[PDB]
Amino acid sequence: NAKRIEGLDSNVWVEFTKLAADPSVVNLGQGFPDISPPSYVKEELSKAAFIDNMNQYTRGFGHPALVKALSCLYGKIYQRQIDPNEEILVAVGAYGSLFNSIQGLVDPGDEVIIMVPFYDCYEPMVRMAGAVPVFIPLRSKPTDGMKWTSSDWTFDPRELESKFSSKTKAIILNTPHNPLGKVYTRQELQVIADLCVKHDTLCISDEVYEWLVYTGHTHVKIATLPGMWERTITIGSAGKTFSVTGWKLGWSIGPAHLIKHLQTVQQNSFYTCATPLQAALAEAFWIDIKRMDDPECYFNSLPKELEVKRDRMVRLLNSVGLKPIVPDGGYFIIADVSSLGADLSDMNSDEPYDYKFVKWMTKHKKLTAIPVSAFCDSKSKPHFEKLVRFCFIKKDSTLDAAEEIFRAWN
Amino acid sequence: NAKRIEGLDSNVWVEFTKLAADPSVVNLGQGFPDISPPSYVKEELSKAAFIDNMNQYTRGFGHPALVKALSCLYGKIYQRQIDPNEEILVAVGAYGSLFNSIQGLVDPGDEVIIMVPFYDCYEPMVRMAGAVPVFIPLRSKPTDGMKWTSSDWTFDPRELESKFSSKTKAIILNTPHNPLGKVYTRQELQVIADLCVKHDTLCISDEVYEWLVYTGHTHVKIATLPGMWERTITIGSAGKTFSVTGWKLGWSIGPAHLIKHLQTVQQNSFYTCATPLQAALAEAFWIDIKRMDDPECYFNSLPKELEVKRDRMVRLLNSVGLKPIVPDGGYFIIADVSSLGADLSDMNSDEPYDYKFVKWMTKHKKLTAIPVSAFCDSKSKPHFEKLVRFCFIKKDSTLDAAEEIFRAWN
Ligand SMILES: Cc1ncc(COP(=O)(O)O)c(CN)c1O
Ligand SMILES: Nc1ccccc1C(=O)C[C@H](N)C(=O)O
Ligand SMILES: Nc1ccccc1C(=O)C[C@H](N)C(=O)O
Known part of the structure; x- marks a missing residue:
């Protein structure tokens, strides 16, 4: 070994x-x-199955229909134009996006900051690339007397400030959170953004659960905050978006000088993802994108x-x-x-x-x-x-x- | 970067x-x-798609049905029992298989031997693991007189010998060869085998084109020579077996103690591979396992x-x-x-x-x-x-x- x-x-x-x-x-x-x-998700796979080309290779970094679509949806979300070939990378699930990010951006000796509890793969990834994980726990606050909710968990800006040293490369953030289902607030996210501008560090943002927000809450993306665009990789997944966990497709969205690095990891690893899956997914995306207000x-x-x-x-x-x-x-x-x-x-x-x-x-x-x-x-x-x-x-x-x-x- | x-x-x-x-x-x-x-391969993917379950997560190291199918097929060819769960790992194409192997077995400073011309991902995969590729050309001999053939390209045993040192961690073998199209002989594989057991080194064997051999030639599998089960990882691919390159599924067959290391990599990178594709390939493999003689x-x-x-x-x-x-x-x-x-x-x-x-x-x-x-x-x-x-x-x-x-x- x-x-x-x-x-x-x-x-x-x-x-x-x-x-x-x-x-x-x-x-x-x-x-x-x-x-x-x-059911249309399952439709498109079938239909993709019967077309010969959709069974042979595609753009290594993302099927051109699929990226064009990611482009479309997400630039509605970011209020910005997102290059489909340079600012997106499709990977084998969010897992493989996390891994393209860490391997591509993080050396032996860096510290990556992680919030506990964490989705469990964040630690061994960061340890596989020789970095030191650095932990900060989420902490309870007095509830409203009435019930217990994810919002009653949160983190202490002054503790966080203190994990940032000159060795911090990145902080991994995951909202909506797994396992507590916390949705980070514009104010919580602004503390993390302040610290990454100030220390010049990456944020890697696990947002696979982005559509899963309940009444009284809003998914907000740190990549949107002033100054984050160019230091953030934001990750999505088909598994979460379309209740199709067994397809194992996701995507990193981000600036080119960061995305090109993840593309390097990809071409040296798995290169291409499955075509029939991405063909079908693109279609599934378009169908829903044309009815957002509905x-x-x-x-x-x-x-x-x-x-x-x-x-x-x-x-x-x-x-x-x-x-x-x-x-x-x-x-x-x-x-x-x-x-x-x-x-x-x-x-x-x-x-x-x-x-x-x-x-x-x-x-x-x-x-x-x-x-x-x-x-x-x-x-x-x-x-x-x-x-x-x-x-x-x-x-x-x-x-x-x-x-x-x-x-x-x- | x-x-x-x-x-x-x-x-x-x-x-x-x-x-x-x-x-x-x-x-x-x-x-x-x-x-x-x-046709069957495309139908089975359609079938797969309309079953709920096989659009969700399946076993990380491979869909049970698929690996059952592979253990059966390859047990046939190795003339030995192959463990479904410990002796096989399914991964994103042969790329990802190659990547698991080098990631899991090869440390910085180690030497890996590569025959030229080589499949071009070999070099960069091995450099990323901090290893030094040690190159050796295939050299031509004279032609029978009527025909130039792959078989008129061979390597020099003594030249090859002198490449293994106490620093050789591994050799990479690609037969049938891409790009020459060379089918290695029992003798040629006997020389590589002799050396690996003398230096106690590993042999990674890219054999995705196993089925594409033409009259007068025979795919021989190095892993089956004396001394080599213990030390070989043999790779194989769905794109090549079923002309379904867009599926990007492959396997690596090999011993449980080498094989476990390839799964430590995978579980920490992308983990699962897609379910409907493996569901469907499993089934294609049954259709052709039960007719091998025809x-x-x-x-x-x-x-x-x-x-x-x-x-x-x-x-x-x-x-x-x-x-x-x-x-x-x-x-x-x-x-x-x-x-x-x-x-x-x-x-x-x-x-x-x-x-x-x-x-x-x-x-x-x-x-x-x-x-x-x-x-x-x-x-x-x-x-x-x-x-x-x-x-x-x-x-x-x-x-x-x-x-x-x-x-x-x-
Ligand atoms: C926070 C989080 N991140 C990443 C993943 C990765 O899943 P996938 O690779 O299958 O998209 C999961 C698993 N549900 C998750 O919950
Ligand atoms: N090399 C690639 C890069 C990206 C996407 C596909 C391919 C290939 O299909 C390689 C082809 N089989 C080849 O050996 O020529
Ligand atoms: N952890 C896994 C390992 C292998 C295969 C699937 C999963 C999962 O589906 C994790 C699940 N999303 C979870 O958080 O409970």
Whole structure:
């Protein structure tokens, strides 16, 4: 094994080849949706399948229809003209966009700043490229007495200021957040922008959940803020946008002197992405782009159809004494697990408290979920190990199955 | 730009983008098939698309059905059991497979041996991993007298020997060869094998064209010689097997302890590959695994087809005075052009001869092709710059248009 991958062989999700295998259990664990995709999405794949060229190679950096379209949608969003060939790069999912960014822009010895809990791949990527990850936790604030929400989490500008030294290359930001479903505010985002201009650092912005915003909140992109355009890579995904997680396409949007670097990583790695997938995706995009103002547009329709599902979950968890944190965005929900009962000597491993709960709730309650501690640096886990993550981009069928379990908990 | 990607930004395939952007030219350059893929392969992708599940995440190291299919197929060819899960890794084409291997096994300062001409991604992949490529030319011997063939290109055993030192981490083998089209013999692979076991080094073997061997020749697989299972990673590709280059799926077969390192890379880069494509390929592989013994199996009829088309091409090139090397395998043909004294004098660049020739041939003759010096390191260009590579994975109609071009050449 090569030095650069030393001690990167434990992956957290490989490890969840633990009980989810069961049949008789409802799985609210992985971000694996079971709603049907928008039927036209499935259409276009078929249609793409039958055209010979759409089965042979395409522009290495993105199928020309697909990039033209990304161009169109996103420059509506940025209020700017976005070059399809120079400011976009299509990669194998958001994962492969994250990886093109880190490998392309970050050396041995740099520090990359990461907010905990983090989507878990941010750490090993940054460690694969020889950098030192630097951690800052999100912290609770007094709620409004009434309920618990993602907005009651936030970060201390003076702590953040202090992680920036002359060794910081980049800060990874992910909004809407996974796992808490925080939507960063214009003010929170402005602190991060201030610091990157001041230290001249990159921001890499994981926005795969961008359309998933609920009432009372707005996805805002840091790349839009004064002075960010030319120091930011913003990442999207087809998986999130069209409930087609199995296609594994996303895109980095950004200025040319940064994008060309990611293009270099790509041509030296995977080069080209699948054509039938990108042909079909472009079409799926155009269909929705021509109806943005309309409640049919998958952009407007899916968060509206997801908010109800979010609420069913808050209830199902209040109903059994799990304290839910209600998410501004994305399709996850964390619940505080700690003011429930039980027993957890059965185990007497001292792997974290939530892993123990999750196994207990799998065996005893026929329900799985993800321990929030998986997404936490070692240092940080004690402070999040009573938190457990649940996923709700599920079909009614499945949320009934779930509601039975809950109904029947006590 | 990160140091790991210093001067890895130029890429030949980029450079060649402006060549036949012209609608009225007949492109025999890119390895872009324009025959039809098998009907079944297109149908299965359609089928796939209308099933919900196979538009979501599947197993990271490969779709269970696909790897089951590959373990079956390749167990047949290696005459041994291949582990579905530990002995196979599915990745974005053979590029990504190559990239997994070098990323996972090759450290900075290590030497990797590469035979010239080489597939051009080899060099840059190995430099990015901080490794030093150590180059050695394929040299010609005399012709039988009637025919110039790939088989008249070989390497010098003692020259090769002297390339392995206590710093050789690996050798890269490409058979069938791109661009010569050479099918290595049991003897030639016996010499490379002898050396790897003497120096305790690895062998990465690019064998995507495994099925395209023509009469009189046989794909032999180095990984099957004594001593080499332990130490070889053998790659293979969906674009080449099913003429579906736009799918960009490949595999690397090899031992569990070498193989695990390739998955540490993948899980930390892009992770999954697309589901519907693997779903569909799985199924195509079943249709042809269960008929291996027939003329109608795609593994059989595709070479049978192209043997015809190749032979058509030896003839056209001989027509206009071009000296073809008739390939044992693959679907490229290399022709010598020096005996034309083309009227380049007055492109005045510092380009090698063959870039100038292809430029000239494009403007004047209306036909593109690829210079072989694109498959050569600096020191080797001059011993290869009179050669030019043409592709014949084309349909009749296309070969026709090429036929007119040659017939009006003088
Ligand atoms: C924050 C975040 N970033 C990136 C990804 C990458 O997913 P994909 O590569 O399949 O687009 C995910 C997985 N859901 C995610 O939740
Ligand atoms: N983590 C993975 C590893 C391999 C294959 C898929 C996934 C996922 O889908 C993660 C999911 N989006 C999650 O955050 O729960
Ligand atoms: N080289 C590429 C770069 C980008 C996109 C496709 C290709 C190819 O298809 C290569 C072709 N098979 C070749 O060897 O000529």
